[PDB]
Design a protein around this nucleic acid. Structure first.
Ligand SMILES: [Ca+2]
Ligand SMILES: [Zn+2]
Lengths: 510, 155, 77
DNA sequence: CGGGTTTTTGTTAAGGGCTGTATCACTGTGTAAGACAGGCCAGATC
DNA sequence: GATCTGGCCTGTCTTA
DNA sequence: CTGGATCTGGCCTGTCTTA
DNA sequence: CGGGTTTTTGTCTGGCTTCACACTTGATTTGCATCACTGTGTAAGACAGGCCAGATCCAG
DNA sequence: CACAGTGATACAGCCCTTAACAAAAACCCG
DNA sequence: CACAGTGATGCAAATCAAGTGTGAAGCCAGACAAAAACCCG
């Protein structure tokens, strides 16, 4: 068909097409059901008499986006209903849970022409459904669940703006309407027509696709180099390097709000350090509610980087020679890089990534590294260390540790305790009084995380990075090259690409 | 342009912060008037858009002098009169007047640089200014067209 | 139309010459011959006159045997 | 070669609807080292 | 034993 | 009244942590 | 809770199409598994420690 | 005078429906 | 336990070709059953 036929058919898939209405009318939200791509600034004034604005933004409306996604998944929901031995005319309360994500991007070049002074950065925000469950009879039964939770074909974009993730003012000014809509939606039901039957929908919002940097910046916490290292418990860097296995999740949103209140009001009238101790390192007002979780991608990246460091320290026998110049460490790093290129076919890189991390964690990699170390017992130490790490990783890296690795799940505490003991005894030269964030996050909190959710790898931020790649591609080859319309085009094209109603036409092999 | 904004013909000495300020002011002006973002290395489209009469008009709003204005106007006029000779795919059938008057225009351009631009072009010159003012008519009469043999296709 | 792809430094003279020697050899060889072939069922005759002009000034200085641009002999013509 | 009769086209008195093309403001490929002239301290020196 | 020389640096200019 | 021992203030400077 | 009055259809009835259906074997054409890799992860902030400077204190 | 794109918008072009006529291409008869 | 690619290669499976006689699923002339969905009775 010609291009105008495509343009006309696009209307059915884009948001703002199907009528819907919540039981108890959303607060501070309009009732217009024909609201599609709108301005992202949300009526922010651009007068010279006020704070300067230098960003642009485009976004949907959140409820309209969810209604469009449900219209898109209607067929999958009906097939799930049929496959579980249920009736299609059931209109019970559907329980939906989604996954949120947000990351900043760099090296986004600015274009010529008129317009505001747009910075050379970008920040994206997206959502992704996870599962749908109806309450039939007494217990529950799941109707649909994403088979590929970390795929780029299921990361629906919501908001796109060319700003800086460190600019707190602009970030809040852009994200506050979405958070308001989310909070208003968290206490309402959605009446929606599927196959000619009004269905009831309820939502459970969970945000886990955030790196630690953004969590610390949003949850009203300090930076990563602070003494409070964990975003789940209240331990400090000192105590975290002495116990390593006995901690409990404590941090939460309401607790952070109360903490900030205590910090601002200062009821007991104490000094700055005593007030920091009382508040446990909270000095800002949170504005996004997130659940305590762990990102698997960045966890693996940090673990591989630290292992890398440990390897290039073991090559130099630092456990006996505490003093060392910079040239010695440079020679050690260069020797390790050349040996990895020779035996592992790996190219030495500067910034740690995922594939390098996946290829580095292997027993034969440890053998190739031990080929560089004269000592004997350090070989055994490194081999046992890597064995423990590789026996622990599938617990949090898999999508269902209760069925894909029950042996490693039920024996996760003993492995973590032995790992901590090995760090304290043999590697004392580096982990005496200090330790990284991920190490604590992995050794202390993840069993509670599985017992609280059931999986960690499914709730990662992989799909977010795949969406960043798709964004880089679309902004360059699937959009008008102009500041006034590039973002709307990219957003619409990505929304069309992420849809499932079109992907079924490509699976015409069964 | 940068040197003319700062009046080098009036103050032969200058610090580095003065240079930085001059460049920033020129970049800011060009961004606000000609709609051109600041770039690190000279581009090709930026070069095409930068070489206009309007650009000189916008730049002259920063030079307080009045003769400098005339100097830059005639400079840009001569350069725009010499451009199509080496940029056209067939100057013998697309711009015969510019081809026949290229020598006179080049001589006037050189005289202008030698008289009113001594502060920069005294006892030194680049490569392409020499190539353009000295060797273009002979290459034209020898091959017939410059620009058709450019290295743009490889780029 | 492409003719050669390599992964080498432009400033690296030894590798550049070692890779480009056969091409220049074949070029200089056939610059004194004529080609015949049958297109449309009729044999034809062809003669070539090659002109290397798509070179920036740095590569011209490199291949022609001159020095960097910062010298005093500035013009290559 | 003509009257008489037939077939297969033109045709604007005005609107509906699908299809093709011009328009607008921009984009990506030109992207690392060498030549040189002036200034300044260690140093052989008459 | 201060006196020019030698050589070493270094910022600028030129092409990318 | 004053020279001089000398005890912190902060300052800049790496190092480690997330990206 | 079932009587009138057209729709909606499978046949009865046997006799005319246009496709359907056994075998080869040597190609010829599709369909699908396999293998070594790819991108998206990409700038600042917290904290300890040596160092003088200058204030803090001592005694003739 | 680099040039192949890049997506939405608008307008011209070319098709389609009531009109009876009216001009172009051909046999039966004379 | 990322994943959808990125191209070539190599092997397994479907098919076609020519050969030809029969075999079988339609449609069709009316027709007067057999429900069967409207009306309400
Ligand atoms: Ca990022
Ligand atoms: Zn913790």
């Amino acid at each position: 068909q010609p291009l105008h036929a495509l343009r006309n058919a696009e209307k059915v898939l884009l948001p703002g097409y199907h009528p819907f209405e919540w039981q108890p009318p959303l607060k501070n939200v309009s009732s217009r059901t024909d609201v599609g791509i709108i301005d992202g600034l949300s009526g922010l004034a651009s007068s010279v008499d006020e704070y300067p604005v230098d960003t642009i933004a485009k976004r949907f409306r959140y409820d309209s986006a969810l209604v469009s996604a449900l219209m898109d998944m209607e067929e999958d929901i009906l097939e799930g209903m049929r496959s579980q031995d249920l009736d299609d005319y059931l209109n019970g309360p559907f329980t939906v849970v989604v996954k949120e994500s947000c990351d900043g991007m760099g090296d986004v070049s600015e274009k010529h022409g008129s317009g505001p002074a747009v910075p050379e950065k970008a920040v994206r925000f997206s959502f992704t459904v996870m599962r749908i469950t109806i309450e039939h009879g007494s217990q529950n039964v799941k109707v649909f669940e994403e088979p590929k939770p970390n795929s780029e074909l299921c990361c629906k974009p919501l908001c796109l703006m060319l700003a800086d993730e460190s600019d707190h003012e602009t970030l809040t000014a852009i994200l506050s309407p979405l958070i308001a809509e989310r909070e208003a939606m968290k206490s309402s039901e959605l009446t929606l027509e599927m196959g000619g039957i009004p269905r009831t929908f309820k939502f459970i919002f969970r945000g886990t696709g955030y790196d630690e940097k953004l969590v610390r910046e949003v949850e009203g916490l300090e930076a990563s180099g602070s003494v409070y290292i964990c975003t789940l418990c209240d331990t400090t860097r000192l105590e975290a390097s002495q116990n390593l296995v006995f901690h409990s999740i404590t941090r939460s949103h309401a607790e952070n709000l109360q903490r900030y209140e205590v910090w601002r009001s200062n009821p007991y009238h104490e000094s700055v350090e005593e007030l920091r101790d009382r508040v446990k390192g909270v000095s800002a007002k949170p504005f996004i509610e997130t659940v305590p979780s762990i990102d698997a991608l960045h966890c693996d990246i940090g673990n591989a980087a630290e292992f890398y460091k440990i390897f290039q320290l073991e090559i130099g026998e630092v456990y006996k020679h505490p003093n060392a110049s910079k040239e010695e460490r440079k020679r050690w790093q260069a020797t390790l890089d050349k040996h990895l290129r020779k035996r592992m076919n790996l190219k030495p890189i500067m910034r740690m990534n995922g594939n390098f991390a996946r290829k580095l964690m292997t027993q034969e990699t440890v053998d190739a590294v031990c080929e560089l170390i004269p000592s004997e017992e350090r070989h055994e130490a490194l081999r046992e260390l890597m064995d423990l790490y590789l026996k622990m990783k599938p617990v949090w890296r898999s999508s269902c540790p209760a069925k894909e690795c029950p042996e490693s799940l039920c024996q996760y505490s003993f492995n973590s305790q032995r790992f901590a003991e090995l760090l304290s005894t043999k590697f004392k030269y580096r982990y005496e009084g200090k330790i990284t964030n991920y190490f604590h996050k992995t050794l202390a909190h993840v069993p509670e995380i599985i017992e609280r959710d059931g999986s960690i790898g499914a709730w990662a931020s992989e799909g977010n990075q795949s969406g960043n790649k798709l964004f880089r591609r679309f902004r360059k080859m699937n959009a008008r090259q102009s500041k006034c319309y590039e973002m709307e085009d990219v957003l619409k094209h990505h929304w069309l690409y992420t849809s499932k109603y079109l992907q079924k036409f490509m699976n015409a092999h069964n």
